[PDB]
Design a protein around this motif. Structure first.
Motif, mmCIF file in Angstrom:
data_model
loop_
_atom_site.group_PDB
_atom_site.id
_atom_site.type_symbol
_atom_site.label_atom_id
_atom_site.label_comp_id
_atom_site.label_asym_id
_atom_site.label_seq_id
_atom_site.Cartn_x
_atom_site.Cartn_y
_atom_site.Cartn_z
ATOM 1 N N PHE A 133 -15.079 -5.843 -8.813
ATOM 2 C CA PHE A 133 -13.555 -4.485 -8.742
ATOM 3 C C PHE A 133 -12.905 -4.484 -10.012
ATOM 4 O O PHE A 133 -12.504 -4.120 -10.867
ATOM 5 C CB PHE A 133 -13.117 -5.352 -7.667
ATOM 6 C CG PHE A 133 -11.585 -4.786 -8.201
ATOM 7 C CD1 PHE A 133 -11.588 -2.973 -8.646
ATOM 8 C CD2 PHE A 133 -10.645 -5.593 -8.386
ATOM 9 C CE1 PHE A 133 -9.843 -2.472 -8.664
ATOM 10 C CE2 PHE A 133 -9.366 -4.707 -8.462
ATOM 11 C CZ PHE A 133 -9.422 -3.658 -8.629
ATOM 12 N N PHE A 153 -0.428 -16.866 -4.271
ATOM 13 C CA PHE A 153 -0.696 -15.493 -5.003
ATOM 14 C C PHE A 153 -0.653 -15.429 -5.865
ATOM 15 O O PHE A 153 0.981 -14.474 -6.930
ATOM 16 C CB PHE A 153 -1.170 -14.116 -4.911
ATOM 17 C CG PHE A 153 -2.296 -12.923 -4.514
ATOM 18 C CD1 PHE A 153 -4.029 -13.495 -5.250
ATOM 19 C CD2 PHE A 153 -1.593 -11.846 -5.807
ATOM 20 C CE1 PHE A 153 -4.366 -11.948 -5.864
ATOM 21 C CE2 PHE A 153 -2.276 -11.169 -6.030
ATOM 22 C CZ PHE A 153 -3.625 -10.938 -5.977
ATOM 23 N N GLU A 168 -37.010 -33.760 -2.504
ATOM 24 C CA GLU A 168 -35.843 -32.887 -2.419
ATOM 25 C C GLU A 168 -35.226 -32.910 -3.535
ATOM 26 O O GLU A 168 -34.980 -31.148 -3.698
ATOM 27 C CB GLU A 168 -35.651 -33.626 -0.965
ATOM 28 C CG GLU A 168 -34.484 -32.593 -0.295
ATOM 29 C CD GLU A 168 -34.950 -31.744 0.420
ATOM 30 O OE1 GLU A 168 -36.347 -31.499 0.583
ATOM 31 O OE2 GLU A 168 -34.695 -30.299 0.674
ATOM 32 N N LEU A 184 -36.598 -38.579 -1.180
ATOM 33 C CA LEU A 184 -35.382 -37.895 -1.491
ATOM 34 C C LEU A 184 -35.593 -37.311 -2.763
ATOM 35 O O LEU A 184 -35.228 -36.190 -3.397
ATOM 36 C CB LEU A 184 -34.494 -38.691 -1.735
ATOM 37 C CG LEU A 184 -33.530 -39.276 -0.573
ATOM 38 C CD1 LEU A 184 -33.068 -38.408 0.091
ATOM 39 C CD2 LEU A 184 -34.275 -39.915 0.394
ATOM 40 N N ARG A 237 0.681 -0.893 -0.112
ATOM 41 C CA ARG A 237 -0.363 0.251 -0.792
ATOM 42 C C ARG A 237 1.080 1.335 -0.321
ATOM 43 O O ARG A 237 0.730 1.741 0.966
ATOM 44 C CB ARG A 237 -1.162 0.343 0.810
ATOM 45 C CG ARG A 237 -1.868 -0.917 1.177
ATOM 46 C CD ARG A 237 -2.855 -1.326 -0.226
ATOM 47 N NE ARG A 237 -3.704 -2.228 -0.241
ATOM 48 C CZ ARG A 237 -4.650 -2.274 -0.131
ATOM 49 N NH1 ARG A 237 -5.072 -1.231 -1.416
ATOM 50 N NH2 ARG A 237 -5.500 -3.794 -0.716
ATOM 51 N N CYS A 287 -4.385 -6.054 -10.153
ATOM 52 C CA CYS A 287 -5.402 -7.321 -9.560
ATOM 53 C C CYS A 287 -5.166 -6.851 -7.926
ATOM 54 O O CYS A 287 -5.050 -7.591 -7.221
ATOM 55 C CB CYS A 287 -4.299 -8.525 -9.585
ATOM 56 S SG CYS A 287 -4.359 -9.464 -11.522
ATOM 57 N N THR A 288 -4.219 -5.273 -7.628
ATOM 58 C CA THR A 288 -3.965 -5.193 -5.946
ATOM 59 C C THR A 288 -5.506 -3.879 -6.060
ATOM 60 O O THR A 288 -5.287 -3.749 -4.525
ATOM 61 C CB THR A 288 -3.475 -5.805 -5.799
ATOM 62 O OG1 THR A 288 -2.919 -5.951 -6.386
ATOM 63 C CG2 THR A 288 -2.499 -4.981 -4.235
ATOM 64 N N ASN A 289 -6.278 -3.682 -6.692
ATOM 65 C CA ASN A 289 -6.985 -2.593 -5.933
ATOM 66 C C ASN A 289 -6.327 -1.697 -5.852
ATOM 67 O O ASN A 289 -6.520 -0.684 -4.719
ATOM 68 C CB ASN A 289 -8.032 -2.911 -5.626
ATOM 69 C CG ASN A 289 -9.083 -1.722 -5.479
ATOM 70 O OD1 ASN A 289 -9.679 -1.040 -6.093
ATOM 71 N ND2 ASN A 289 -10.312 -2.388 -5.181
ATOM 72 N N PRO A 331 0.228 -22.130 -1.393
ATOM 73 C CA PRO A 331 -0.789 -21.259 -0.335
ATOM 74 C C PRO A 331 0.490 -20.133 -1.423
ATOM 75 O O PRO A 331 1.665 -19.233 -0.790
ATOM 76 C CB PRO A 331 -0.310 -21.491 0.750
ATOM 77 C CG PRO A 331 1.186 -22.288 0.970
ATOM 78 C CD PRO A 331 0.969 -23.417 0.076
ATOM 79 N N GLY A 359 -3.432 -25.389 -5.202
ATOM 80 C CA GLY A 359 -3.288 -26.059 -4.042
ATOM 81 C C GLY A 359 -2.437 -25.493 -2.933
ATOM 82 O O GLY A 359 -2.498 -25.539 -1.764
ATOM 83 N N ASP A 386 -18.327 -8.707 -4.327
ATOM 84 C CA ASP A 386 -17.016 -8.104 -3.823
ATOM 85 C C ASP A 386 -15.466 -7.835 -5.159
ATOM 86 O O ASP A 386 -15.015 -6.936 -5.384
ATOM 87 C CB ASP A 386 -16.861 -7.706 -2.567
ATOM 88 C CG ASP A 386 -16.109 -9.429 -2.488
ATOM 89 O OD1 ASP A 386 -16.112 -10.210 -3.280
ATOM 90 O OD2 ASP A 386 -15.844 -9.482 -1.501
ATOM 91 N N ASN A 387 -16.147 -9.001 -5.775
ATOM 92 C CA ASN A 387 -14.204 -9.296 -6.331
ATOM 93 C C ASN A 387 -14.695 -9.328 -8.132
ATOM 94 O O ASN A 387 -14.057 -8.030 -9.200
ATOM 95 C CB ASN A 387 -14.359 -11.105 -6.390
ATOM 96 C CG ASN A 387 -12.449 -11.052 -7.450
ATOM 97 O OD1 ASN A 387 -12.276 -10.038 -8.100
ATOM 98 N ND2 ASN A 387 -12.285 -11.810 -7.323
ATOM 99 N N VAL A 433 -7.760 -13.894 -11.736
ATOM 100 C CA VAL A 433 -7.735 -13.906 -10.363
ATOM 101 C C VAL A 433 -9.499 -13.801 -9.810
ATOM 102 O O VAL A 433 -9.689 -13.223 -8.779
ATOM 103 C CB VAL A 433 -7.509 -12.149 -9.954
ATOM 104 C CG1 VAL A 433 -7.608 -10.994 -10.494
ATOM 105 C CG2 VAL A 433 -6.196 -12.878 -9.453
#
Ligand SMILES: CCCCCCCC/C=C/CCCCCCCC(=O)O[C@@H](COC(=O)CCCCCCCCCCCCCCC)COP(=O)([O-])OCC[N+](C)(C)C
Ligand SMILES: CCCCCCCC/C=C/CCCCCCCC(=O)O[C@@H](COC(=O)CCCCCCCCCCCCCCC)COP(=O)([O-])OCC[N+](C)(C)C
Ligand SMILES: CCCCCCCC/C=C/CCCCCCCC(=O)O[C@@H](COC(=O)CCCCCCCCCCCCCCC)COP(=O)([O-])OCC[N+](C)(C)C
Ligand SMILES: CCCCCCCC/C=C/CCCCCCCC(=O)O[C@@H](COC(=O)CCCCCCCCCCCCCCC)COP(=O)([O-])OCC[N+](C)(C)C
Ligand SMILES: CCCCCCCC/C=C/CCCCCCCC(=O)O[C@@H](COC(=O)CCCCCCCCCCCCCCC)COP(=O)([O-])OCC[N+](C)(C)C
Ligand SMILES: CCCCCCCC/C=C\CCCCCCCC(=O)O[C@@H](COC(=O)CCCCCCCCCCCCCCC)COP(=O)([O-])OCC[N+](C)(C)C
Ligand SMILES: CCCCCCCC/C=C\CCCCCCCC(=O)O[C@@H](COC(=O)CCCCCCCCCCCCCCC)COP(=O)([O-])OCC[N+](C)(C)C
Ligand SMILES: CCCCCCCC/C=C\CCCCCCCC(=O)O[C@@H](COC(=O)CCCCCCCCCCCCCCC)COP(=O)([O-])OCC[N+](C)(C)C
Ligand SMILES: CCCCCCCC/C=C\CCCCCCCC(=O)O[C@@H](COC(=O)CCCCCCCCCCCCCCC)COP(=O)([O-])OCC[N+](C)(C)C
Ligand SMILES: CCCCCCCC/C=C\CCCCCCCC(=O)O[C@@H](COC(=O)CCCCCCCCCCCCCCC)COP(=O)([O-])OCC[N+](C)(C)C
Ligand SMILES: CCCCCCCC/C=C\CCCCCCCC(=O)O[C@@H](COC(=O)CCCCCCCCCCCCCCC)COP(=O)([O-])OCC[N+](C)(C)C
Ligand SMILES: CCCCCCCC/C=C\CCCCCCCC(=O)O[C@@H](COC(=O)CCCCCCCCCCCCCCC)COP(=O)([O-])OCC[N+](C)(C)C
Ligand code: NA
Ligand code: NA
Lengths: 531, 180, 531
Positions: C107, C48, C462, C459, C15, C60-62, C46, C44, C103-104, C97
């Motif tokens: 944007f 970005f 339903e 079932l 930022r 992609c970060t606004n 972790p 899978g 919200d995504n 992304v």
């Protein structure tokens, strides 16, 4: 038509207090009875009933400003306990105008509250809510007897916070400790009114009266009945259930071991006969009981010819069970073997009337309520249309048959088998036109088995999603009637052991005496009423 | 049938077996109670009318149970005196039991299925949880070192100043409004 | 892990535009490729992914403020069409992304819009949305190929109101008259992209890709397919339906009139044999067609082993139908009578595969979608549990039998009859313990017939309340695949008569040339857009 009207009545309705004070001061009476046809109960006619008294109109017309003016005006003040030809005071009449809409209910309770204090300020000694109309009903009994859920929900939960006007309040808080507070409801003229207890007016009422099944959900009624249930009625009901199960065990065996060789009445020869006729005696006695116990019901609850199936479906079957028993005695001494016909319908009704005793059990009693609704709603519609089809296509079929199923019974009997999964598409060869016979049965099958039975399943499911709550509330009302029919019958002399609540001194007579009231304790918690 | 135990390793099958055991205890037990009252009510009636062989409460109850499995004969006896009674009574049995009560059960089940759908997913996860716990106890029961979910992750410090080592479980997450 | 990272990448994520301008001015490159493991596709792990380029991160970060700064900063400006190792430009990466949250989605569309104008202002001549990554996909095709409903719904409906930036807009209004206004969508690279038309990317995709069935509800796609349907595909489909019905009529009769005396291959003796073998020839040819036509499918749509039943249940059956036909030819010249076994499964599949052609009809095709869902969802769960019970109680029963139903087939066959309403509770007397045999069958019956079949009905209900919309949208996708498989196969040389839309000059090249675009007209009305 307008017989009894005054120009004072005009001014109250035309939004004119400037002229109400004008007319009263010149001597316009404020006791005048608008005893005219337009001013009586509507009953379809285009009218407005308000109470046949000027003060009553202003209370039912939402000018509280006017209402107070009528009672401290110096020229002449309306008598607060003045009643009409029907006997309805302002509070009586203020109930009969309620219609259980929020905008109405918010008002009537807002107004009903205020005549009480006013009458208390004017007259701390007169008791208004105890006043009874011509019929013998109070404003509380009238609200319950007429379906007025919000008025009743107000009167029972009436907690007032004023120095001189708590002797009118009914929902008292005895103690409080942090978030815990322990309320107290009054039970005066709710469980043991000499005339028209609220319970005995909700439960001994007619389904025409709206919100029978919703009124008992008003506090304290629900908690009060579950208190009678847990204390003394549950044991007696299980006992009543046991005796009926022993009754049906006995009527079953005396029926199973009926004599088969001869004509009645039969002879005591061996020992098993003596020990059987006993069961046959005991069988009849229950029928007499259920006979008298049904006559009783259908007198003191003068039944609306349509209400029989809705409110009283089980009572109808116990009574009908009784009739088959009595016909079974008329025909056993009349030497006719047809006693058995009657006797077997008594058994089948007798054992199915076990479902009566489901009402001591929530999830079973709600299930039996759903059963009796499906019977009257979904099944009767079904079987009507089914029999039109059955009889429509049978006649068609048996008209085509030539020759043996050349009978409307057997064809109708063969076509009923399709719907119980036992249809032969070849039950006759005795005809001339196989195309017709098959097209017609297939049309029968498609319309009845594939469509209409499966449509019923679909209709039932719609019903179950709807009557689910209705059936819980019809259940609680069934149990209520058991609690009331019990505490009457069982005690019927002493009426001292079922006393729900206790003497709790809540406050004081506005003169100064102590305020002792039979009251029902309820323990409650809050986490936002921090004060 | 206890194979259905092992459905709880599988979500959509285990939820189905949860619905089964609920229907048994809720909808079927209520049903079969009322059904047997009717079955026994109308059987006694029928066998009291029979004269002579179905002159037995078993066989009559056994014949009247066949109506509900689609195998009812409306003519399983001629041995009686009053055909009107025998037929009115069986039709009343059939209408009450086959047409109404079985089809009412279908309708009751559907109400139940719309209700226990979420409840049964959460009873399923709890069934699997008990398997996970009964497993990791029984299997290891001596070492208890290979099932260590998480890892030593130093997160911070003792307020005195020592290191703060804690067995911790990592979870990866995304936001599109916590822009700071 | 972080291979390729710069301190400029830090500042955009922390930022910090005050230091982005600090680093660029001192010469920090703004083409740097963060070609490190953390910066690639998550899958899978972790991570970005943002585009492996600084400008791509800011988009992609606004921080639109930062983004514009990167492109008119005087020291050095990012190349707008600069792509990464994957080939993804900023717009490509800006799709990947997206996650289809409001919200995504608000944007990404808000940002995607703004790089276009910026690139247009910088470069009125460069075409960004036409750029293709390493695989061969555009930002439009990537959005459709990856499930990005809001991005796609934006790009197609892109109406921009600016003097210089309407040549990018796609949804044009041609005329307007009061409340009536007549829009125009573009169809460039939607119906006839040389590579990866939007239709051919929504429909030739895998169910793993979310919102396949929702993407075609985006305008103009729905209207566009109903235009191909009404113009040329409906006639061809009904024709394809007729030929298949004539095929099955012919394969039916050649099967019914099969020789019965001898071993195959049989002899042409009488005339009916010649006119039958013809049908037998024609029978096989369809199998070859459906064989090749299935091989084709399962190559150019490399099937995920689970996706077979969800996306391709019918194709599986036509192929399987073909296999039984070919086995019927292998066994007819191998002299084996077992050709009939194969042949009868082809017929039964063949006629059931009529339900394929329900997809030319809305309410029937939705019904066939519900059928195939119930099969895979409700019935497979059922039959599993049913067979556990069936086999559980059968073994129990046949273990009790002594002596003929002393066989696991016949007992399983007798216990299956209970569930089709044909159960005998007395199919054996050959045992020692009647109590066991009856308790056990009743337990079987109660568990299977009373509970489990009726539970299935419950079932299904339903399911029907849930898949009702899903099945309408799976239907439209089934029809879409027919429209696409049709317009390929039928034309396959000319591809000129299915041209949905027309040459409509909408505007101008920003240089000044005319803007001709194949466009799809849509007529619309409003009663609140009064301007
Ligand atoms: C269970 C709970 C309920 C209450 C208790 C009841 C206990 C139950 C027992 C009670 C008495 C048993 C009799 C014993 C001596 C005779 C034996 C005999 O010959 O039996 C025979 C008949 O037997 C009968 O017909 C008996 C009558 C049974 C009616 C049920 C009892 C009535 C209640 C008042 C009695 C006192 C109870 C009062 C206190 C409650 C047995 O049948 P069979 O030999 O095949 O005969 C032909 C059969 N056929 C006609 C079908 C073709
Ligand atoms: C007693 C004489 C007969 C034997 C008993 C037989 C019946 C059973 C006993 C009945 C009375 C005594 C039971 C008290 C203890 C609790 C029972 C129980 O399990 O309740 C549970 C299940 O619900 C039931 O078990 C109720 C089912 C029977 C209702 C009667 C229907 C027809 C009887 C025909 C019988 C054939 C007669 C012919 C052969 C004898 C809970 O009930 P619930 O739905 O959640 O309701 C709230 C429970 N509560 C009120 C307790 C708070
Ligand atoms: C192994 C021993 C026996 C053979 C196997 C037989 C059973 C099959 C194998 C079972 C175990 C091994 C399978 C692992 C691979 C996935 C299976 C699969 O297709 O799952 C899918 C379908 O769901 C099922 O197939 C589950 C059905 C069987 C559950 C057991 C019920 C009773 C068994 C009585 C059998 C008769 C025994 C008598 C004869 C032997 C997906 O399941 P799901 O519902 O979406 O749940 C989430 C999936 N997940 C957990 C994988 C994420
Ligand atoms: C319908 C729409 C589809 C298309 C039109 C098809 C028209 C339909 C007709 C076509 C030909 C009829 C033959 C006529 C002369 C012989 C008569 C005869 O003996 O018949 C006999 C057998 O007959 C057969 O076995 C004929 C084979 C019929 C196969 C269906 C046609 C194949 C398509 C290519 C043909 C040209 C069509 C090409 C253009 C489309 C009649 O039966 P049977 O006497 O009881 O014999 C023993 C019976 N058993 C074996 C069961 C025990
Ligand atoms: C053609 C060859 C065979 C004869 C025709 C037989 C089938 C009928 C004709 C089919 C094709 C030509 C019909 C066009 C005219 C409209 C039909 C109609 O009434 O639609 C209506 C009913 O829906 C149906 O009638 C559709 C049912 C048939 C679908 C195919 C299923 C399996 C065929 C097995 C057949 C056995 C084959 C073996 C024996 C031959 C409306 O449909 P909808 O659901 O509201 O959908 C929107 C309608 N729309 C798309 C028009 C806008
Ligand atoms: C050795 C000889 C005796 C053998 C054993 C005796 C036991 C025999 C066993 C069963 C039959 C018992 C007698 C008939 C009663 C029928 C059942 C009945 O009405 O039950 C009621 C229970 O509530 C009661 O009050 C029942 C009676 C209580 C006394 C116990 C039985 C002994 C009385 C008899 C004298 C015995 C001496 C001889 C008699 C010839 C029903 O409840 P309810 O509240 O009315 O609600 C249902 C109806 N309603 C909804 C329409 C309102
Ligand atoms: C629930 C079951 C279905 C309906 C039952 C109620 C209907 C009542 C039924 C029969 C009539 C009532 C009995 C009268 C006296 C005996 C005459 C008789 O039975 O039939 C006569 C014929 O008659 C017909 O074929 C037509 C009779 C039915 C039409 C009357 C309307 C019924 C309306 C209500 C209908 C439901 C409307 C739809 C629902 C809203 C004589 O026939 P048979 O004696 O058999 O002849 C045998 C000859 N043999 C001796 C040589 C063998
Ligand atoms: C919504 C309103 C309610 C519905 C109203 C309408 C419902 C009308 C329902 C059905 C009408 C159609 C079925 C046939 C009816 C009998 C006509 C006939 O004579 O057939 C002949 C068959 O002749 C043949 O050639 C066989 C073909 C028919 C198959 C049998 C139908 C299957 C049952 C389900 C069909 C469901 C279809 C219906 C779908 C709507 C019978 O005579 P046969 O002597 O046996 O002839 C051949 C014998 N041989 C081959 C041995 C030589
Ligand atoms: C689940 C199925 C239905 C219910 C089963 C449980 C009931 C138990 C059933 C039978 C009694 C228990 C066995 C005792 C000893 C043997 C006596 C006997 O069987 O019957 C005796 C008669 O008896 C009758 O006709 C009446 C007996 C039933 C009434 C008792 C209440 C049952 C309560 C619960 C009911 C459910 C309540 C509703 C649900 C809440 C003797 O008859 P038999 O021997 O056949 O005579 C043949 C003569 N032969 C030799 C010439 C051929
Ligand atoms: C919610 C509470 C549960 C329900 C409780 C009540 C349920 C009561 C249900 C049904 C009662 C009505 C059916 C008849 C019952 C038998 C009476 C009788 O003796 O009939 C005689 C028929 O006599 C006739 O004249 C034929 C007319 C009847 C048609 C058969 C009914 C079809 C089955 C479905 C009807 C469903 C209707 C019911 C709708 C409610 C039989 O004797 P038969 O010797 O064969 O006589 C004529 C023979 N012959 C023509 C060859 C000469
Ligand atoms: C005198 C002799 C001729 C008699 C009359 C001939 C007519 C005989 C009648 C039927 C059988 C016709 C030939 C076999 C085709 C099988 C049906 C089929 O695939 O239909 C396709 C229709 O789409 C087509 O393209 C069908 C072929 C069009 C030509 C018309 C038939 C004549 C060709 C034959 C040469 C005849 C000469 C002799 C041949 C030996 C199926 O549609 P689909 O879009 O594929 O979708 C379904 C499958 N999928 C979903 C998996 C994709
Ligand atoms: C779908 C229908 C139900 C299941 C079908 C699949 C099971 C396969 C069934 C049979 C076995 C497979 C065939 C092997 C070779 C032949 C042996 C044989 O058939 O049986 C042998 C016995 O065997 C038994 O009694 C036990 C066999 C079944 C247990 C194996 C597990 C099945 C798992 C899956 C089960 C589903 C699990 C639940 C669902 C998840 C020999 O018996 P026989 O030859 O009949 O002897 C007759 C003697 N005679 C000549 C004197 C007359
Ligand atoms: Na059946
Ligand atoms: Na059946």
């Amino acid at each position: 038509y307008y017989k009894g009207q005054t120009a004072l009545h005009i001014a109250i309705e035309r939004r004119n207090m400037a002229l109400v004070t004008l007319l009263v001061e010149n001597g316009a009476d404020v006791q005048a009875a608008a005893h005219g046809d337009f001013f009586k109960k509507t009953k379809g006619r285009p009218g407005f009933y308000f109470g046949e008294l000027p003060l009553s109109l202003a209370a039912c017309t939402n000018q509280l400003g006017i209402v107070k003016f009528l009672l401290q005006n110096s020229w002449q003040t309306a008598d607060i306990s003045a009643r009409d030809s029907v006997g309805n005071t302002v509070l009586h009449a203020l109930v009969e105008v309620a219609d259980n809409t929020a905008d109405n209910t918010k008002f009537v309770t807002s107004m009903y509250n205020e005549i009480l204090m006013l009458g208390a300020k004017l007259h701390p000694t007169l008791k208004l809510e105890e006043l009874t109309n011509k019929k013998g009903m109070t404003p509380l009994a009238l609200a319950a007897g007429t379906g007025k859920i919000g008025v009743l929900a107000y009167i029972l939960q009436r907690e007032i916070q004023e120095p001189e006007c708590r002797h009118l309040s009914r929902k008292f808080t005895e103690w409080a400790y942090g978030p815990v507070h322990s309320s107290l409801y009054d039970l005066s003229c709710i469980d043991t009114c000499e005339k028209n207890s609220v319970l005995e007016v909700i439960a001994y009422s007619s389904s025409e009266t709206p919100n029978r099944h919703d009124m008992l959900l008003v506090e304290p009624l629900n908690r009060l009945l579950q208190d009678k249930w847990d204390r003394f009625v549950k044991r007696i009901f299980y006992f009543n259930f046991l005796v009926y199960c022993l009754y049906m065990i006995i009527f079953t065996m005396a029926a199973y071991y009926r004599p088969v060789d001869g004509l009645p009445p039969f002879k005591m020869e061996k020992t098993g006969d003596y020990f059987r006729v006993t069961g046959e005696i005991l069988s009849v006695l229950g029928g007499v009981y259920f006979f008298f116990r049904g006559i009783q019901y259908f007198l003191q609850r003068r039944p609306s010819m349509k209400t029989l199936f809705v409110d009283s479906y089980s009572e109808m079957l116990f009574f009908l069970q009784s009739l088959f028993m009595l016909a079974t005695v008329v025909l056993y001494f009349s030497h006719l073997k047809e006693y058995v016909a009657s006797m077997v319908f008594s058994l089948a009704l007798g054992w199915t009337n076990m479902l009566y005793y489901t009402r001591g059990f929530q999830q079973m009693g709600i299930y039996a309520v759903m059963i009796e609704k499906m019977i009257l709603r979904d099944l009767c519609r079904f079987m009507f249309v089914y029999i039109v089809f059955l009889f429509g296509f049978s006649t068609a079929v048996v008209t085509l048959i030539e020759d043996s199923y050349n009978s409307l019974y057997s064809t109708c009997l063969e076509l009923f088998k399709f719907t119980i999964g036992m249809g032969d598409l070849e039950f006759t060869e005795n005809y001339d036109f196989k195309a017709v016979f098959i097209i017609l049965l297939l049309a029968y099958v498609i319309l009845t088995y594939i469509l209409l039975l499966n449509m019923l399943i679909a209709l039932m499911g719609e019903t179950v999603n709807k009557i689910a709550q209705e059936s819980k509330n019809i259940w609680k009302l069934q149990r209520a009637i058991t609690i009331l029919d019990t505490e009457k019958s069982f005690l019927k002399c002493m009426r001292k052991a079922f006393r729900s609540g206790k003497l709790l001194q809540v406050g004081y007579t506005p003169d100064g005496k102590d305020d002792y009231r039979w009251c029902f304790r309820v323990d409650e918690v809050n986490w936002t009423t921090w004060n």
